[PDB]
Structure formats: C-alpha cells, structure tokens
Symmetry: C4
Subunit: 195 residues, 4 copies
Amino acid sequence: DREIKEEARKLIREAIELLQKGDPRAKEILRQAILILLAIRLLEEMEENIEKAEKLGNEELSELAKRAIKLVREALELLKEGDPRAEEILKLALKIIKAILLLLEMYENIKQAEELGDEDLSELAKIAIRLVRQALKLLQEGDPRAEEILEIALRIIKLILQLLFLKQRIEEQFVFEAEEKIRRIVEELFKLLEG
Amino acid sequence: DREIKEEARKLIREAIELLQKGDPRAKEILRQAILILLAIRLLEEMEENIEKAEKLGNEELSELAKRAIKLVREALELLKEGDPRAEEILKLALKIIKAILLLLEMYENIKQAEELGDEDLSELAKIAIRLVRQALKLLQEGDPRAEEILEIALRIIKLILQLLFLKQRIEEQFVFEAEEKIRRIVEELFKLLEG
Amino acid sequence: DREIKEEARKLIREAIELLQKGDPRAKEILRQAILILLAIRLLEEMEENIEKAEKLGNEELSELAKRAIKLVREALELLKEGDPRAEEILKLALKIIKAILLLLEMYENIKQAEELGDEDLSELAKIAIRLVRQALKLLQEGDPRAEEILEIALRIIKLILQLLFLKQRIEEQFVFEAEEKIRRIVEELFKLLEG
Amino acid sequence: DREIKEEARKLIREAIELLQKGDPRAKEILRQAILILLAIRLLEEMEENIEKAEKLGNEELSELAKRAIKLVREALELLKEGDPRAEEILKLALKIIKAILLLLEMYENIKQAEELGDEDLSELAKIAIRLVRQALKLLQEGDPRAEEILEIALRIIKLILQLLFLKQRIEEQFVFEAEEKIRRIVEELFKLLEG
C-alpha cells in the first residue's frame, strides 16, 4: 500500500505543483490522487477490522473482506496503468468495503439481537449478508448488476441498523426520530425494489 | 401472525436463495417479504398498545385499533393470494396503524392539556380522531378518499404534537426550532387543504 | 377573541361533523378553522408580550404590536363575512405578528449588544425595526409591497439573531454551524435583494 | 475600516430612511450596505487571527492573510466608486478570507496530525494551502478561474477537517454521522473535479 501512497503523492505533485502552470484538466489527476488517498486509508483501517472479523468468528465476512481487499488492490494496480473502467470499478470496490465494515458493525450489534432472539432480524440479516456476497460475486464477474444489487444490500443494512438503534432506545420524543427516518428508508427501499 | 412470518420467510427464500439464479424481477418478491416483516413487527407492538388504550379507557381508539388490525390481517391474507390492489391496501393499512399508535401517544400527551384545560387542543384533537375514524371507514369501504383524508389526519396530529412539545418547552434558542417547524407544518397543511 | 374561538369551533363542526356527509370542498372550511385557532393562540401570547414590550420601554414596538393586533382582529372580522382577500391579509398579519414577537426576543438579546457596544448591530437593527414599520404601514395601506418588504425585514432579523448567537458562543466545532448557516442566510438575503 | 463603516451607515440611511419614499431599486443600496457591514466585521476578526498566524509561525498563511486583506480593502474602495465588477470581486475576496480563517483553524487542528504523523493529511493539506495560494494569485490577476480553483480549495479543506474530527472521535452511533457526511463531501468533490 505504501507504494500506492507514494504513487498518489507523485500524482498530486504532477497535478498541482507542476500542472498549475499547465492543462486545467489536471483536475482529473487531482481526483485520482485524492481517490487513492481515501482508498489507502480505508484499506488500512479494514485490515484491523479483519482481526475484528476473525475474533468475531464469521468466515463469510472474512472471505468478503479478503476478496474485497484483493479487488481494491487489483483496481489500484489497473489504475496505475489506465483503463477508465478502473474508475467505476474502484468506486464500486470502495463502496463494497464500506458496506463490509458496516456489516461488521451490524454483526456486533446483532449480537444484541441474538441475546434478544429477534429471529426476524436474524433471517433478514442473513439475506443481507448473502446479498452482499452476491454483489461481490457479480462485481468479481464484472456484471453491471453489481451496483444494482449492492444498493439493495446497503439499504437493507441501514434498515436493520435503524431497527437495532430503535431497539436500544426502546431499552432506554426521543424515539420519534427513528419512527420518522425508518419511514424514509422504507419507502426509498420500496422505490428501488418496485420502480 | 407467526404463520404470516413463516410465509414471509418462504417469500424471502424464494426471492433470494432461489431467485439469485433467475429472474431479476425477484425484487418484487423481496419487497413483499420485507413488507410483511415490517407489518408483523408493527402488529406485534400494536397488540400491547391496545392494552395501553384500554387502560387509557377510550373506546373510540380501541375500536380504531381493532378494525385496523383486522384490516391489516385481511390484507395479508389477500396478499398471500395476489390481487395487486393488496399492495396499496397494505401500505394504507400500515400508515393507518402508524397513525393510531401516534394517536395513543398524542392522547397520553393530551392528558397534559386536560390538566391545563387547553380546550382548543381538545376540540382540535376531537376533530383529528374523528377524521382518522372517517379515513378508516372510507378504507373499509375502499373509497380512494381514504388516503386524502388520512393525510390531513396525520398533518393535524403532527401539528397538535408540535404544540404540545412547545407547551412542554414552555414548562421548561430552545423554543426557536419549534417556532420554525410549526411554520413548515402549518404551510404544508394549508397547501394540502387549499391546493 | 373568545367569540372568535367559538366561531372557529362552529366552523370546524360544520367542516367535519356535518361536512363529512357532503361536499369534499369542506377542506376550505377546515383550513379556515385551523387558521383561526392558530391566530387566536398567537394573539393570546402576544398580549402578554405587550407587557414585555412596555417593561422593555420601547414605544415603537408597542405601536407595532397594537397596530398588528388590530390588523389581525379586523382580518378576522372580515373573514367572518367572506372576501377571499381576507385569506391573504390574515396570513400576512400573522407573519407580521410573528416578526414582532421575534423582534421583542431580538431586542432583549440586543440588550447584550448594547452592553458590548456593537454599534454595527445597533444601527442594523434600527434599520430592521424601521423596515418592519414600513411593512406594517404598507400592509395597513394594502400595498402588495407589504410582503416584499416584510420578507427582507425577516431576513435581516434572522441574520442579526444569528450574529448574536454567534457572539454568545464566542463568549462560550461548536462555532462551525453558525459559520455555515450565516452564509446560507447571507446568500439568500442577497438573492432576494439583487434578483 | 471605521471610515468604511461610516460610509456603510450613510449607504443604509440613503437606502432606507430616504429611499423608502422612492425607487424600489434601493434594495441594491441596502445590499451594498449590509455587504460592507459583514466585510468590516470579517476583517476586524481576521486582523486578530493574523496575530494567531504569527504565533502559529507560518509565513505562507501570513502572506495569504495580508494579501487577502489588501484585496478586500481595495475592493471596498472600488465599490465606493462603482464598477459593478466590484460586487463579484468583493464576494470572492470575502470567500477567500473565510477560507483563510478556516485554514488557520485547520492548521491548529493539524497540529494534532503532526503529533500523530498523519503524513497523508500533511501532504494533502500542503496541496490545499498551495491551491488557496493559487486561487489568491489568480484573483489578484483577475482570472475567472479564481472561483473554480477556490471551490476545490474549500472542498479539500472541508474534507480534511472532516477527517480530523473523525480522528478525534476515534480518540473518543457517534462515528456514523461522519461516515455519512464524508461520503457526500467526497462525491461532491468528485463531481466538481470530474464533471
């Protein structure tokens, strides 16, 4: 990754310190540089979240993490060469890793659900995890449906988290915000699924 | 209800574990499944809120709850078969139950107003309750005006709650946010009523 | 006012308990009733805010209050008869009274500024007060410019309050929100004044 | 500056106390007056923030401040005469000074990063500072790209601050809001850079 950080630093130097006197298009190079910086930070944190996953003891999430990591690094290596499709792939891969970290947070929360026995949330989260797996699989295959399924994965994950935070506040008007926002999430989810 | 939860689980299974290899339209089935899950949770909480209502000793709200419950369950049984109108009816019924739970919260608050003697809010709330009754009645009749009246019911209920929270703040700039949001609600209410 | 409250109650009764069996247009009457209720409450609070004004010892604000009160009551009496223009006039009068209460809050705050010697805010607030006076005068004349000037009055008042809250937080990132919202208010104010 | 404040007071007097009887266009003069008031306050605070900068011991920021101050004062003197381009130039100059104060806040925060050794943020901030320098330079030259570069300067600065506040939260769901907001900032930044 450090090599990638150095490549990013070179990109930023060319984009600004050199390119200020040159083509205004250098905004492209600047974009690539900042993108690489965000990606590097994201992977840096995710590699510790992998230790989290292993101590959380779910192999599905660990595989998700590892495949996503390799996806991102492959995308970075391709971007080092070019292939504008690398832009789309890198954005998608970062969104995926975002979703996987969010998944680990969700899973740690769902420990609470298991303690409660909210089997409804359990099955729903199972579908969510498998959905993310399907999105990762499609992305590995390059199917444009990667985004289409991923967005539904995200929306189900946010809904689940919303219900978990509502449950915790129940354990504690302070519940009104959730009763509202869950409705926007629900209707956006329906809008995506229905058309 | 549990049978309904099991039906929902079957729906999700067909929608994802099977349908991943098949028609992308499975988003429809997924939508139905998640919808059923939300509905089941909502009724589960509402059946306790019925005991709340009875201890609150208002028969109008109790009848509202019971008829809404039966509406929702009828809609679920229909959805088990099909009839795309089941989608509209189920959405409306859930919004209605939302409004009735909100009503119980409002009524418990309006206990404060009765202590104060805010007869203005009392009469206004009476109109709101009867409005909800009218919306439920129309929905029972299937008149498309169900949504039109229901939306006004909701907006009046939110306004009433806003004034109650303003009153509590008065018992307590911290009042500014209410002064703004009441204005937005008021002008949206007028926009609906006037056109 | 109490007679007006009773008239409002009659309006709501005709609008709902009677009108449910009749013309769906009853939303108009419902709107009028809710409007009258809001106005009643607003004047009820403002009459005590007049005592506030007199203890604050500014005759300009006191005259503003008295003329606005008479405006609102005249509009109510007109509405009792009809003349759809009463709708516009009543809305404007309520917004004006809102602005005058806001002014009293602003003046009490500006006591702090006088203690500080923020003569800039002092002169700006002078312009704001005179602007409100001009809007009230035009409204008394029925000039359509009443709204056009009033909106600028409001926006200057909000800006002034924003600077006062910023000053207090200065006495106290917790200042970032003001740095943003002042910018939005400023650019909206410019958009209104410039076109 | 005080002379400018007095000129602004004269502008407001002509715009309101005189102009109420005539040309509705006086909104222009009112706009100019309020604009001058904001500018004067801004410079008044920035001159102390210059002492901050010198105690912070960065000559780049000190030059930024001094050149921006002179820019603003030149623009004020021009606006005293006319040349509607003074409007654009003064708006840009104020946004620049805003960005420079924000920079000083960012730099004081980045003291934390230097303590941590977040060389990524360090290099990124270097690019941000040089970008602001470039925007100031172009503006001094009158190149219309002043705004185009400045906006990217601002967006990178906000992103950097967002990451610093996230880092502090890390030293402290409470992290969820940042994980959300950084995404909007990032995608807006990309939208600007990419088109």
